[PDB]
């Protein structure tokens, strides 16, 4: 019971966690929180210093646990995510347990090196400035001929997603050429430089070292893979292949909330990750200082203290007509997903100038799409395909 001292202010340099706890019947709120701060670690012990409740929800309370600075290894996300929640999810005295937040200190953030490339550094080889990006998911020659005609409508890149590895009908080597030979025939014929994002996933890593040394020999743009079925350990052998090459940046009741998973992934690395609370972590990946917003999931306060930002990816689905709704919410510094590709670039580029006139793009969004049909035939088709469903039942 020396693991619960509410007479204590957590220091300037402490590591500092939260937990949205839910106990079994009759279990007090003050012993479940000492059942968390003690069984995490083992002056070397975490101490639950606050016990705040949650209004109008199933019996939760917010436990504020404060681990010291020296308890952990400098520059490691695997250690921080494992010495904290190792065997704390495995109790039967709790109905649920989530990990809502972590404050890293200023002293421990700048041990890490972070994302290799930021909101500034991305614009060097990427020839797009001040406007968000576009990119759509896609035998072996016929597969190369299809990305040959998606980038020719405005797509800033494309995606070799849905897990295309070397199968006996379509090998790994004969997919790289035919979507390298398909970039050399759309770079000059459209006036911009485009990539095609390609999987590097192999059984070993020695084979994965050959699926990433062949890709960029000097051949090819910035080309990515995932974090699931992989770790912060698996993607450390190749996120630090961007420390030589600048080539892989896109990362594609009872849990751990995404804003803990997003602190773990900026500090690991990468330039634009896939995903009030939707506005919440996208003001953690992009901001410098964030003050405590309890109604946003942002329960703490930590300045990022001069470390490279990281943008966001659109995560709702196909969005061809619902274009100005994304432009306000994710802002300028984000990334979004041949007739069907030329309708995408036109609806994006149009709204951005009607924002800068001063027109309220929230209360006017559809009419900006409609005026862009009178010089673009591919937006004449799309607006009729999408949904005008309403209710005027007052």
């Amino acid at each position: 019971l020396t693991y619960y001292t509410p007479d204590y202010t957590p220091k300037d340099t402490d590591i500092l966690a939260a937990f949205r706890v839910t106990p079994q019947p009759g279990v007090p709120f003050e012993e479940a929180a000492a059942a968390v701060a003690a069984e995490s670690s083992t002056r070397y012990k975490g101490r639950c210093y606050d016990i705040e409740p949650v209004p109008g929800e199933d019996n939760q309370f917010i436990a504020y646990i404060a681990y010291p600075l020296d308890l952990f290894e400098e520059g490691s996300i695997t250690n921080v995510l494992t010495s904290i929640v190792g065997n704390v999810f495995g109790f039967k005295a709790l109905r649920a347990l989530r990990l809502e937040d972590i404050r890293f200190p200023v002293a421990y953030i700048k041990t890490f090196q972070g994302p290799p490339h930021g909101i500034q550094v991305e614009r060097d080889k990427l020839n797009k400035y001040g406007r968000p990006l576009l990119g759509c998911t896609i035998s072996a020659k016929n597969y190369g001929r299809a990305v040959y005609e998606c980038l020719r409508g405005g797509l800033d890149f494309t995606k070799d997603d849905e897990n295309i590895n070397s199968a006996p009908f379509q090998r790994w080597r004969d997919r790289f050429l035919f979507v390298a030979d398909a970039i050399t025939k759309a770079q000059a014929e459209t006036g911009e430089i485009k990539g095609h994002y390609l999987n590097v996933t192999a059984p070993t890593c020695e084979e994965m070292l050959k699926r990433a040394e062949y890709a960029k020999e000097l051949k090819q743009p910035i080309i990515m893979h995932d974090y699931l079925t992989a770790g912060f350990t698996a993607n450390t052998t190749l996120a630090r292949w961007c420390r030589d090459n600048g080539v892989l940046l896109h990362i594609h009741n009872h849990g751990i909330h995404f804003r803990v998973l997003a602190k773990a992934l900026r500090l690991s690395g990468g330039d634009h990750i896939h995903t009030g609370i939707t506005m919440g972590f996208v003001d953690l990946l992009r901001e410098n200082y964030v003050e405590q917003d309890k109604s946003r999931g942002i329960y703490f306060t930590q300045d990022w203290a001069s470390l490279p930002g990281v943008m966001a990816v659109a995560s709702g689905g196909i969005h061809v007509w619902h274009m100005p709704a994304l432009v306000e919410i994710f802002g300028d510094d984000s990334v979004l997903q041949a007739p069907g590709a030329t309708a995408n670039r036109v609806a994006l580029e149009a709204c951005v100038q009607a924002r800068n006139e001063g027109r309220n793009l929230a209360r006017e969004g559809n009419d900006v799409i409609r005026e862009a049909a009178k010089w673009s035939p591919e937006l004449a088709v799309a607006c009729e395909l999408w949904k005008e469903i309403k209710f005027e039942f007052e």
């Binding site: 279990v27 012993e31 479940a32 059942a35």
Partner: protein, 101 residues
């Protein structure tokens, strides 16, 4: 008779429902408060399922576990005693068949 056996059984039922409380009590404090895990075996020797006799001894120390032992019994006696009529009859069909064969 036919009626007093039903109060006779209900006195014995209430005892075994307090057992499932204390096994749920004991299986949870084994990791949360291990100082409060090897001292619960000071009061449960021979008969575990007591209701207040241990509490009369726990008043002269901290008696708070009892009000949790009596709130474990709530969620089981409200979710078994209504479903009890088929749950005991279904096992009768097994022990009718196994003995006939």
């Amino acid at each position: 008779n036919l009626k007093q056996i039903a109060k006779d059984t209900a006195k014995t039922l209430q005892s075994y429902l307090t057992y499932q409380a204390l096994m749920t009590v004991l299986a949870q404090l084994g990791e949360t408060n291990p100082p409060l895990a090897l001292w619960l075996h000071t009061f449960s020797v021979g008969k575990v399922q007591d209701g207040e006799a241990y509490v009369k001894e726990l008043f002269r120390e901290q008696p708070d576990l009892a009000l949790r032992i009596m709130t474990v019994r709530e969620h089981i006696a409200e979710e078994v005693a209504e479903f009890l009529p088929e749950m005991v009859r279904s096992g009768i069909q097994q022990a009718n068949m196994e003995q006939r064969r």
